Structure formats: structure tokens, C-alpha cells
């Protein structure tokens with residue numbers, strides 16, 4: 106416990122994450138321009154409206170590829186367990202900045218895991234429905250009725266994921282010190298103690314113990 | 322755009338900022354295709370392409386007279402042939418296909434690009450290509466499967482109802498060319514009268530289910546048919562029985578939008594008022610006192 | 611814009627979003643100026659300005675018949691006179707000058723404003739003034755030194771090939787007016803045939819190097835000449851021998867763009883991945899442990 110910080114995120118998972126974020130800004134904004142045509146300015150997200158129609162789906166595929174790399178590296182830490190119940194019951198208390206007092210928080214809390222599955226499920230929905238409605242390459246192989254349902258579902262899934270990311274960015278801005286961990290990779294031990302007790306307890310034990318195991 | 326000042330509907334335009342439409346005191350026009358007088362000559366396909374300066378590719382014969390086999394960016398109208406014994410004797414039902422110029426167009430309703438699809442006061446629904454982004458939403462929104470994308474420019478095209486002839490007082494090219502007068506053109510009101518007279522003569526010849534195809538589901542069409550078997554439109558190479566704008570498309574383009582809007586506004590309010598109300602979540606709010 | 615749906619090239623438009631061009635099945639047209647039949651009457655200058663509603667200033671005489679002395683925003687075509695004894699006897703070579711309506715226009719290629727310069731399926735290259743920003747890049751991109759800026763509105767103008775007459779079925783004003791029939795007009799295919807017949811008669815009269823000027827460097831032109839001395843076009847008041855789009859302009863408008871794009875994307879990636887990889891450079895990274 107004699108270091109200002111502890112590593113929370115490896116460089117590879119940090120590089121990926123900020124790649125996703127940049128791709129997501131372009132894809133969400135172009136998507137929103139088709140959804141709300143009154144917001145004319147967003148038709149210039151990829152330069153021109155004609156260009157935006159072409160590039161949206163390609164950047165969409167890139168997000169899904171990078172989210173699948175994230176999926177295989179974080180899924181094991183996002184698994185719901187009986188210890189998450191406490192969180193789910195004192196949500197009102199957590200939102201007032203008192204989660205430590207009410208719950209058992211490991212690597213990622215119960216909100217973060219709900220988000221994780223939400224985000225991962227929506228991107229799968231968006232990938233499937235996106236392919237189905239993609240002209241000129243793929244929509245021609247699908248029955249008109251499936252294309253129509255896909256148009257409805259893709260719009261709805263994209264809106265749900267945008268909401269979700271608005272809340273995800275808010276929380277990251279709100280639980281102070283979090284953005285620095287995602288940019289630089291390190292979290293101060295006290296942040297760990299307050300927001301993620303069980304997690305830091307494990308690092309601290311893994312740490313000390315294996316260095317005690319060496320035989321100083 | 323809007324030089325004619327008679328634009329009654331415009332794609333992707335908020336309902337509280339309607340397009341210019343002061344010069345709307347004009348009669349609705351309509352084409353009437355009486356399939357009982359059609360001889361399947363394809364003159365209309367030829368006259369349409371000649372007039373419109375378009376040429377499709379030289380295709381193939383795959384066992385039927387139909388050719389081209391479908392509408393395309395280079396073929397705005399196509400003759401569809403059907404051989405059937407469903408009514409008790411051999412019948413060759415031939416129907417001209419192409420845009421129906423719906424009163425309530427699904428293409429226009431599904432389109433996400435402002436001004437790409439417009440509806441004139443006389444009933445013509447036309448594509449304004451400078452605004453088309455090639456998304457293809459209109460292909461799915463159309464109940465009749467009409468719009469076609471041009472691979473060479475990523476824009477959709479279809480029958481314009483010869484808006485360039487009709488706008489200056491002349492009937493469309495396919496209407497004028499039709500050898501047997503199966504295709505008629507005039508005001509919608511007088512085409513509905515001709516339609517009802519023709520139905521009456523077909524009934525007198527034994528076709529008890531003759532009728533006019535002018536679907537109420539899309540608000541009536543400016544391209545109408547007189548059919549010998551109006552109870553069985555699908556016999557005419559799949560013409561839809563009781564077409565309407567799909568329910569999924571209606572909900573996607575309709576209620577989902579304002580609902581999403583409320584969520585977004587509400588969410589932004591909540592998060593903003595939440596941050597201000599409770600304040601940040603820093604490492605120590607406690608050694609601040 | 612794009613109402614005619616036959617726009618084959620459009621300035622400052624990405625190659626993967628081409629302009630509307632479904633109605634492209636139209637014959638290419640062309641003007642043929644046979645300078646061996648030209649009498650230097652200037653009727654074409656007068657007919658062009660009368661038709662186009664433009665008037666240049668009353669200029670000055672500086673020793674030659676040429677007047678105005680150059681093309682301008684108010685003079686879209688000008689007669690250029692040359693006196694020479696280069697071929698062994700005194701000859702007065704007179705040539706009508708003005709836009710060549712190139713198949714591969716350099717003006718269009720150099721223009722940085724979307725839609726300011728377009729090329730129609732029939733070969734006409736025309737300026738869409740609502741989009742012109744007055745930069746003048748087209749003046750340098752043109753191999754023939756044609757475009758001219760109007761000081762009163764900061765926009766470039768030139769011969770439109772009487773697009774307003776040709777678009778509705780009439781030949782251009784200067785073509786119709788030419789007293790001796792030095793200027794001819796029709797489809798490009800039949801003007802090339804008339805050109806070759808005229809060359810044959812000029813050779814029969816002793817002009818062994820007569821020829822058609824339809825430069826391959828710009829992909830051929832829709833304004834072509836029949837020249838008595840086709841081996842020496844510069845005798846005709848500097849008409850370029852083997853014109854082409856300048857190499858510097860090709861590289862500036864071509865490869866430099868994507869190269870710059872890659873640099874910028876690559877640079878942004880590098881700097882972003884660099885900051886994240888190594889982290890800030892603060893006064894003490896060391897008392898952080």
C-alpha cells in the first residue's frame with residue numbers, strides 16, 4: 106500500500122476502448138442524422154450525407170470487431186453473482202454517492218456489468234439488423250418483411266445503445282478519477298478502496314502474498 | 322427546389338414546417354390501366370425508355386415473355402405475364418407494372434433525407450435526386466416494391482408519371498403510345514368514371530368480380546387498374562390484395578421518434594440535474610469538512 | 611440541381627458519390643469551326659452576346675482587327691487574327707476562340723467548390739454559378755485559358771455551348787448566324803465525318819497538313835476545328851499543340867489529397883496512441899511512487 110497508484114487497465118484494453126469511442130461518435134451521430142432529419146448539421150458527420158450513408162455501416166462493423174476483443178477480455182469480470190444483489194437493492198443509495206456503505210464491489214460493480222451486457226447485446230443486435238438493411242451488398246438476399254422488421258429493430262437498438270453510452274460517460278465523469286485510469290491505466294489505492302473494495306483487496310493480497318512467497 | 326409552390330408532402334420534413342404549397346388548386350390526375358384490353362405488346366416499355374433517355378441491358382430469355390424480368394433503375398415500367406386456369410379455362414392475364422403514385426406514399430414516409438421524395442398537388446410522387454443518399458429505405462417502405470437503385474450513382478429511380486410532360490399539359494408517353502387504348506389518362510375524377518363504365522361492361526360479359534383497383538389502404542392511387550378478377554389481384558403476377566404501409570414501418574417512422582426524443586431530453590435533464598443535485602463522487606467528500 | 615439527371619462529372623465531388631446520371635443515353639453533340647471558310651466577320655461575337663444578354667465595354671483599337679482583345683466575363687467568344695508568311699506567301703489565319711467543352715475538363719478537375727462546374731451527358735461543360743466561390747482555380751486548370759471572372763459578382767463565366775438552346779432542340783446562336791457556314795453543329799459523330807470530308811478537300815487543294823483539331827490529351831473536345839495547317843496550330847493565334855491537363859495540376863488535385871489524408875489520419879492515430887501509451891510528461895512522475 107506504498108504507491109500512489111495501481112494499474113487497473115492494460116494499454117491494449119485502453120487503446121481499444123478509445124478506438125471504439127471515436128468510431129462510436131461518428132456512427133452514433135450519422136445514425137442520429139437519419140433518425141432525426143430535422144438535425145441537419147449531423148448529415149455532415151462524415152462530410153456529406155451521401156458519404157455518411159456509405160461509411161456508417163463500415164465504421165459500425167469496426168466497432169463490433171473491437172467490442173468482440175473487449176468481450177473476450179472483460180467478460181469473466183462482468184459475471185453476475187449473488188454478491189451483486191445488495192447493489193441492485195440500494196440503487197437509490199448508490200446514486201447518492203454512498204455505494205460503499207451499501208454493497209460489495211469487486212473489479213466492476215453491478216451497474217457496470219448490467220451496462221456491459223446491455224452494450225454487448227445491442228451491438229450484436231445492431232450487427233445482425235445492420236447487415237440485413239445494408240444496400241447495396243446484403244439487403245437483396247432478405248425477404249422484404251425481414252428487412253422492414255430489421256429497419257425497426259436497428260433504429261430502436263441504436264437509440265437504446267446511445268442512451269446507454271450517455272449514462273456510461275456520465276458515470277465515468279461522475280465517479281471522479283475514472284477517466285484517468287482509462288487514459289493512463291492507473292488508479293489510486295484509495296479510489297480502489299472506496300469504489301471497488303473487494304477488487305483492491307484481491308490485488309493487495311495477490312501482490313503482497315506472491316512477494317511474500319518469493320522469500321524476501 | 323419548391324419553384325412550383327404546390328408541394329403537398331416532402332420526405333423527412335417536420336410536420337410543423339410544411340413545404341411550399343400555396344398553388345394547390347389543381348385537379349388530381351390519373352392513369353387508368355384496363356388490363357382487359359391489354360395485348361401485352363410492351364409498347365409502353367419502349368415509349369417510356371425512349372422518352373426518358375434510359376436503356377436497360379440486353380437480358381436473357383428464361384422461359385417466359387416477361388423482359389426485362391423486373392423493374393430497375395433503367396426500366397421504369399415492365400409488363401408482367403401470368404398464365405392461369407384458376408377461373409376454369411386458360412387465361413393469359415397481362416399487367417403493366419410500375420409506380421402507383423399513392424396518395425399516401427410509403428416511400429416518402431420511410432425516406433430519411435429531406436426533400437429526396439416529394440408529392441405534387443396533382444398526385445404525382447417524384448424523386449428529387451440531388452437529395453437522395455442511396456439508403457434504400459424507400460424500397461422497404463413501398464407496399465408495391467417499386468423503387469430501384471442505380472449502381473452508377475447510388476440513387477433510386479422509378480416512373481415519374483412523365484412529370485416533365487404532364488407539368489406542361491401533355492399526357493405521359495406510355496399513355497399516348499398504347500395500341501389498344503388499354504391505358505387511359507385524364508383527371509382522377511374522370512378516370513374513376515371511365516373505370517366504372519368499363520367494370521359495368523365486363524360484368525355484362527360475365528365477369529361478376531370485375532372491379533377498379535384503387536387501394537384505400539394507401540389512400541387511393543393515381544395509377545389505377547380495371548381488373549377482370551378484382552377479387553383475386555394476386556393472379557396478376559402478385560398484385561397485392563389490400564395493400565397498406567407496413568405496421569413495422571409505420572411505428573418506426575412514427576411513434577418511435579418522439580418517444581426516443583422524450584427519452585433523450587428526459588435523460589439529459591435527469592443526468593444534469595443529478596450531477597448538480599448530488600455533486601461529484603470524489604475519493605474523499607469527507608475530509609472536505 | 612440535378613433536375614436533368616444526366617450529370618456525368620461534377621466538380622469537387624468524391625468519386626464514390628457520383629452525381630445523378632441515369633438519363634445518360636443521349637448522343638454527344640459538337641460544334642465544328644472550319645477556319646478555312648471563316649471570313650472573320652465577328653457575327654458569332656455579336657450573336658453570342660445578343661442571345662446571352664451580355665455586353666462588354668466599348669474598348670480601343672491598338673493596331674489590330676481583334677476586338678475585344680480577349681475573352682472576358684462579358685465576351686464568351688472572340689475572333690483571333692494572325693498574319694503570317696511562315697508557309698511561303700501571305701496568309702490571314704482567323705480563328706474563333708472560346709470554350710472547347712473538353713471531354714476531360716481541367717476547369718472541373720481543378721475546381722474546389724462542389725457543383726460549381728458540371729458536365730452533361732451530351733458533352734456540354736457548364737458553370738453552375740450559385741456554387742462558384744470566385745477562387746479562379748479553373749483559370750489555371752484549363753489548358754486553353756478560357757474561364758473569366760466577373761468583377762461585379764466574383765464568379766467565372768464562359769461559352770455554355772448555348773445549353774439553353776441545345777437542351778430544347780435548337781443549335782447555338784453563333785452556329786446559326788455564321789455567314790459562310792464556317793461553323794457547323796450536330797452530333798459529334800457526324801461533325802467528325804464532316805471534318806474528315808473537309809480535310810480531304812483541303813488536301814486536294816494543296817494543304818498537305820490539313821487536319822481536324824480534336825485533342826486526345828483532353829479526351830477530345832465538343833468544339834473542334836478544321837485547320838489548313840494542323841501541324842502548326844500555334845500559327846492560329848496560339849492554339850496549343852497537343853494540349854493536356856498540366857502535370858502540376860494533376861498531382862495537386864490527384865495523389866496529394868489521399869497522401870495528405872493518410873498523413874493526417876496516421877498522425878492523429880500516432881499522437882493519440884502515444885499519449886495513452888506513455889502518459890503525460892508532468893514535473894514529477896517519480897514522487898508518484
Ligand code: HEM
Pocket residue numbers: 129132133134135136137139140157158159160161162163165166168169228231232233234235236238239240259260262263264266267433456
Ligand atoms: C454493428 C454494425 C452496424 C451496421 C452493419 C449498421 C448498418 C446500418 C445501415 C446500413 C443503416 C441505414 C443507413 C445507411 O446505409 O447508412 C443504419 C442506420 C442506423 N444505424 Fe446502424 N449500423 C451498425 C451499427 C450501429 C450503431 C453502433 C449504432 C448506434 C450508435 C447504429 C445506429 C443507427 C441508427 C440510429 C440508424 C438510423 C435509424 C433510422 O434511420 O431511423 N448503427 N445502420
Ligand code: HEM
Pocket residue numbers: 113122125126129175179183213217218221224270273274277278283284285286287
Ligand atoms: C467519452 C466516452 C466514454 C468514456 C468517458 C468512457 C469511460 C470509461 C471508463 C473510465 C471505463 C473504465 C472504468 C473503470 O475502470 O471502472 C470504461 C470502460 C468501458 N467502456 Fe467506456 N467510455 C466511453 C465510451 C464508451 C463506448 C462508446 C463504449 C462502447 C459502446 C464503451 C465501452 C466500454 C466497456 C465495455 C467498458 C468496460 C466495463 C466493464 O467491463 O464492465 N465506452 N469506459
Ligand SMILES: CCCCCCCc1cc(O)c2ccccc2[n+]1[O-]
Pocket residue numbers: 196214215216217218219220272273276277280283
Ligand atoms: C440502474 C442504474 C444503472 C447504473 C449503471 C452503472 C454503470 C456504471 C457505474 C460506474 O460507477 C462506472 C464507473 C466508470 C465507468 C463506467 C461506470 N458505469 O458503467
Ligand code: SF4
Pocket residue numbers: 354358359360361362363364365366400417498499500501502503504
Ligand atoms: S402499351 Fe398498352 S396494350 Fe401494350 S403492353 Fe402496355 S398497357 Fe398493354
Ligand code: SF4
Pocket residue numbers: 332428431432433434437438448452453454455456457458459460468476477
Ligand atoms: S434511397 Fe433516396 S429516396 Fe430512397 S429513402 Fe434513401 S434518400 Fe430517400
Ligand code: SF4
Pocket residue numbers: 419420421422423426427428429446462463464465466467468479
Ligand atoms: S408505389 Fe411505391 S414508389 Fe410509388 S408512390 Fe407508392 S410507395 Fe412510392
Ligand code: SF4
Pocket residue numbers: 368369370372373397398419479480481482483484493494495496
Ligand atoms: S407515366 Fe411516363 S415515366 Fe411512367 S411508365 Fe409511363 S412513360 Fe414511363
Ligand code: SF4
Pocket residue numbers: 643647648649650651652653654655689706787788789790791792793
Ligand atoms: S461568324 Fe463564322 S465566318 Fe464570321 S467570324 Fe465567326 S466563325 Fe468566322
Ligand code: SF4
Pocket residue numbers: 621717720721722723726727737741742743744745746747748749757765766
Ligand atoms: S472560380 Fe468558381 S468555378 Fe472556378 S474553380 Fe473557383 S468555385 Fe470553381
Ligand code: SF4
Pocket residue numbers: 708709710711712715716717718735751752753754755756757768
Ligand atoms: S476549354 Fe477550359 S473552360 Fe472549357 S471545358 Fe475545357 S478546361 Fe473547361
Ligand code: SF4
Pocket residue numbers: 657658659661662686687708768769770771772773782783784785
Ligand atoms: S455556343 Fe452559344 S454560348 Fe458559345 S460562343 Fe456560341 S453563342 Fe456563345
